[PDB]
Design a protein around this ligand. Sequence first.
Ligand code: CLA
Ligand code: KC2
Ligand SMILES: CC1=C(C#C/C(C)=C/C=C/C(C)=C/C=C/C=C(C)/C=C/C=C(\C)C#CC2=C(C)C[C@@H](O)CC2(C)C)C(C)(C)C[C@H](O)C1
Ligand SMILES: CC1=C(C#C/C(C)=C/C=C/C(C)=C/C=C/C=C(C)/C=C/C=C(\C)C#CC2=C(C)C[C@@H](O)CC2(C)C)C(C)(C)C[C@H](O)C1
Ligand SMILES: CC1=C(C#C/C(C)=C/C=C/C(C)=C/C=C/C=C(C)/C=C/C=C(C)/C=C/C2=C(C)CCCC2(C)C)C(C)(C)C[C@H](O)C1
Ligand SMILES: CC1=CCCC(C)(C)[C@H]1/C=C/C(C)=C/C=C/C(C)=C/C=C/C=C(C)/C=C/C=C(C)/C=C/C1=C(C)CCCC1(C)C
Ligand SMILES: CC1=CCCC(C)(C)[C@H]1/C=C/C(C)=C/C=C/C(C)=C/C=C/C=C(C)/C=C/C=C(C)/C=C/C1=C(C)CCCC1(C)C
Lengths: 188, 176, 173, 92
Amino acid sequence: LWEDGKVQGKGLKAIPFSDPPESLPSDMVGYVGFDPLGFSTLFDIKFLREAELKHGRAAMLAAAGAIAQDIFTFPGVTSVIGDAKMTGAHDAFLKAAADGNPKANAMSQLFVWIGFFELVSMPALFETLNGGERAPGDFYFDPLGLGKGSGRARMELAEIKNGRLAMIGIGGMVHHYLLTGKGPIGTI
Amino acid sequence: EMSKAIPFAERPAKLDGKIPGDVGFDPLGFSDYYDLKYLREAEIKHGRICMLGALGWLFPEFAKLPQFASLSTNPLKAATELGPAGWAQIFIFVGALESFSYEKIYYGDSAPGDLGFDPLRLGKNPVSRAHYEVAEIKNGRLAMIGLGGMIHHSLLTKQGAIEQIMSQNFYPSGFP
Amino acid sequence: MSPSVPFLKRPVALDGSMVGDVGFDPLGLSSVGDIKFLREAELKHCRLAMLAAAGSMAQDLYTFPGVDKVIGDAKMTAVHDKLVSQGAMGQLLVWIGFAEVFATMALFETLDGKRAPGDFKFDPLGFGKNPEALKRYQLAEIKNGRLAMLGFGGMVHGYFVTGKGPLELLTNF
Amino acid sequence: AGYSPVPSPDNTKETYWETKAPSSQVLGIGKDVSSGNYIVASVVAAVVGAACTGQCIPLTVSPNPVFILGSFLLPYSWALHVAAWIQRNNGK
Ligand code: CLA
Ligand code: KC2
Ligand SMILES: CC1=C(C#C/C(C)=C/C=C/C(C)=C/C=C/C=C(C)/C=C/C=C(\C)C#CC2=C(C)C[C@@H](O)CC2(C)C)C(C)(C)C[C@H](O)C1
Ligand SMILES: CC1=C(C#C/C(C)=C/C=C/C(C)=C/C=C/C=C(C)/C=C/C=C(\C)C#CC2=C(C)C[C@@H](O)CC2(C)C)C(C)(C)C[C@H](O)C1
Ligand SMILES: CC1=C(C#C/C(C)=C/C=C/C(C)=C/C=C/C=C(C)/C=C/C=C(C)/C=C/C2=C(C)CCCC2(C)C)C(C)(C)C[C@H](O)C1
Ligand SMILES: CC1=CCCC(C)(C)[C@H]1/C=C/C(C)=C/C=C/C(C)=C/C=C/C=C(C)/C=C/C=C(C)/C=C/C1=C(C)CCCC1(C)C
Ligand SMILES: CC1=CCCC(C)(C)[C@H]1/C=C/C(C)=C/C=C/C(C)=C/C=C/C=C(C)/C=C/C=C(C)/C=C/C1=C(C)CCCC1(C)C
C-alpha cells in the first residue's frame, strides 16, 4: 500500500478535531496522525519507533506462540511442566528449575540468548539515535528476500499494523488466562 | 515608580512588572542582589515541587496504591515506612528529571522554568499561555504556603490533614 | 557496514587488514586498548584452546602408561586437580612460565611495532615459505583457533553438566 | 628559575581544559570508546554491581569470589557515566 494519502501519511488524521503534534513525522510508516498525549514531543521519534517495532514483533511472536502452545505441545514438555498454559508454563519451568529438574531451563536459555542478541544490538539503537544510517527497526535481516523492491512499503505498513494488533491481542490473551485460566482457543 | 503590592513604597528597580507573576513585591530586595532569572527559576521549581507535595499530602488519605495500603495516612509516617529501596528509586527518578534542569541552567539559556515539557500543547495560544504562566506561579506560591503548613500540622498532630480537620484538633499542645 | 553484523557500522579500529577480519566488534571492544595487543591475545587464546581441545579428545581416547593409577576415573578438570597434587601441573606451569616470560619480551617488542602479533618465528618444518600459502595458513589458524575456543568451552561445560569427556559423551549420550 | 626540568612519564599530554568538557585524552585507553558504549557500560555495571553487592550484604564466612569481583562494578559505573558525559560533550 504505502498510500501516502490513503492508509498512512499526509492529511491522515485519526482525530479530526485535534491536529497531530508538529514533531510527529508524516513520512514514517504507519503515520495515521495519532499522538494526542504528545509522546513524540517528549521523546525522540527514532527511539519511539524502535520501541514500537520491538514491542510489535515481541507481541506478534507471543500471540502466535500462545495459539501454537494451546493447539500443540512439543513431545515431552508435559512430563516436565505437567499441564500449564500461557504464563503458567513460564512459572512452571521456573519452578522446576528451582526444584532442580534439568529439562526445565528453557526460560533461562531463552533469556540468555535473547539478552545476548539485545546486548549486541544495543549499539545499533545508539547509532540510530546518533544520526546513523540505520533506520529505527531495520536489522537488515531479510534472508528469504521476501520484502524487497515494491513490496517493501506494503510489508512495513503490514508489519506495523499487525504488530499493534498483536500488542492488543497478547494483552487480551494474558488477561483472559489470568481470569478464566484458559488459553486462546479455550476461551473461544 | 510605586510598587503594586506595597502602594506606599517605591517599585523595586529590577521588578518592572513585565515578567509573569510580578506585582512589585520585594520588601527585602532579593532581586537587587541575586540574579532575577535564577530567582524566577527557583521560584517556579519550588512551586512545582510544592504543588505536587500538597496534592500528595492529601491524596493517600483518599486512596492508596494497593502495594502501599498498609502505609500510614500520615505522610511523614509513610515516608519513614517506605524503605530505602523505594526511596532510592524515587531519588534516581528525580535526579534523572533534574539532569535536564542542570543542562538548561548551566549549559543553556531559555525562559525560566522552560524544560520543553508541554506534551498536550496547551501553551501555544499566547493569551492562554500568559494566563497559564501567571496561574502556575500563583498556584505554586499557594502550594508552597499550604505544604509548609501541612508539614508542620503533621509534625504537631501526627495525623493527616483531612484527619486533623475532621477530628478538629486544630490547636497545639506544645512542642512535639 | 560491518559485513558480519549488517545493521551496525564497521568498527573504527578494524579496517579489514588483519586476517579473519569480518568487521565483528558489536560492543566496540577494539576501540579500547591497542588492536595489536588484542590480536596477540586472540592468537594466544586460539593456539592454547585448540591445543586444549585436541588434548581433551586425545586424553579421552588414549592415556599414557601408568597415568590411570594416578588419576583413577578422573576426566578433564578432575585430572587437573588430581595431578596438581602429584606435581605434573606444577612442572607444566614452570616451563610455560619460562616460555611466557620470553613471550612477555615478545609482546613488549610487538607494542613497539618491531614484531607482528602472534609471530614467534616458529616454522621448523618450513610450511608457509610461499607468501600465499602463509596467508592461507594464517586465515586457517585464526578460524580453527576460534572454532577450538568454542569447542573447548563446550567440552568443559559438557563435562560439568554430565561428568563425561567429549568423545565418551558423544559415544553414548 | 634554575630548577632542573621535571621528568614526567612517556607520552604525557596536556589535559588542562577550560572548555565545557575535558579533551577525551583524560580517558586514556578508553578515549576512543563511544558515548553510547559508555552509557550501556555504566548501566550494566551499576545493575551487576548492585546485584552482587546485595548477594553479599549479609557477608558470610565464605563469600563468593565472583560476587566480590562484580561488586566492584558499582564504583566502576560512576566513572563510566562520567566518561559518557565527557564523550557526549566532546562530540561523540
Ligand atoms: C494555607 C495556609 C494555612 C492554613 C489554611 C493553615 C491552617 C492551620 N494551621 Mg497553620 N501554618 C501555615 C499555613 C496554614 N495553616 C504555615 C505556612 C505555617 C508555618 C510553617 C503554619 C504553622 C502552623 C502551626 C505551627 C500550627 C498551625 C495550625 C493550624 C491550624 C490552626 C490555625 C489556628 O489556630 O489559627 C489561629 C490563627 C492565628 C493565631 C492568627 C495569627 C495571629 C496574628 C496576630 C494574625 C494577624 C492578622 C493579619 C491581618 C494578617 C495579615 C497582615 C499583613 C497583611 C500585614 C489550621 C488547620 C496549628 C495546628 O494544626 O495545631 C495542631 C498549629 O499549631 N499552623
Ligand atoms: C611413554 C611415555 C610416558 C609418559 C609420557 C608417562 C607419563 C606419566 C604421567 C604424566 C604426567 C604420570 C602421572 C605417570 C604415572 C605413572 N607411570 Mg608413566 N609415562 C610414560 C611411560 C611409562 C612407562 C613405560 C611406565 C610408566 C609407569 C607409571 C607409573 C607406575 C605405577 C605403578 O607401577 O604403580 C605411574 C604412577 C610404569 C608402570 O607401572 O607401567 C605399567 C611403567 O613401567 N610410564 N606416567
Ligand atoms: C505541565 C502540564 C501538565 C501538567 C500538570 C500537572 C500534573 C499539574 C498539576 C498541578 C497540581 C497538582 C497543582 C496543585 C496545587 C495545590 C495547591 C495550590 C494546594 C494548596 C493547599 C492549600 C492552600 C492548603 C491548605 C490547607 C492547609 C495548609 C491546612 C489544612 O488544615 C487546610 C488546607 C487543606 C486548606 C500536563 C501533564 C497536563 C501536560 C501539559 O502539557 C502541561
Ligand atoms: C604451526 C606449526 C606446526 C604445528 C602444529 C601443531 C601442533 C598444530 C596443532 C593444531 C591443533 C591441535 C588444532 C586443533 C584444532 C581443534 C579444533 C578446531 C577443535 C574443535 C572442536 C569442536 C568444534 C568441538 C566439539 C565438540 C563439542 C563442543 C562437544 C563435545 O561433546 C564433542 C564435540 C567434538 C562435538 C608444525 C608442527 C606443523 C610445525 C610447523 O613448522 C609450525
Ligand atoms: C509472563 C508473566 C506474566 C505476564 C505477562 C504478560 C505477557 C502480560 C501482558 C500484558 C499486556 C500485553 C497488556 C496489554 C494491555 C493493553 C491494553 C490495556 C490496551 C488498551 C487499548 C486501548 C484502551 C485502545 C483505545 C483506542 C485507541 C488508543 C486507539 C483507537 C481506538 C482504540 C483502539 C479503541 C504475568 C504478568 C502473568 C506474571 C507471570 O509471573 C509472568
Ligand atoms: C528533613 C526533615 C526534617 C524534620 C521534619 C521532616 C521529617 C518533615 C523533614 C522535612 C521537612 C520539610 C520538607 C520542611 C519544610 C518546611 C516548609 C515548607 C515550611 C514553610 C514555611 C512557610 C512560611 C513560614 C510562610 C510564611 C508566609 C507569610 C508570613 C506570609 C505573609 C504574607 C501575607 C499574610 C500577606 C501578603 C504578604 C506576605 C508576606 C506574603
Ligand atoms: C601465587 C603466588 C606465589 C608466590 C609469590 C607470588 C607473589 C607470585 C604469589 C601471588 C599471589 C597473588 C597474585 C595473590 C592475589 C591475591 C588477591 C588479589 C587477593 C584478594 C583478596 C580480596 C578479597 C577476599 C576481597 C573480599 C571483599 C569483601 C568480602 C568485601 C565485602 C563486601 C562486599 C563485597 C559488598 C558489600 C559490602 C562488603 C560486606 C564490605
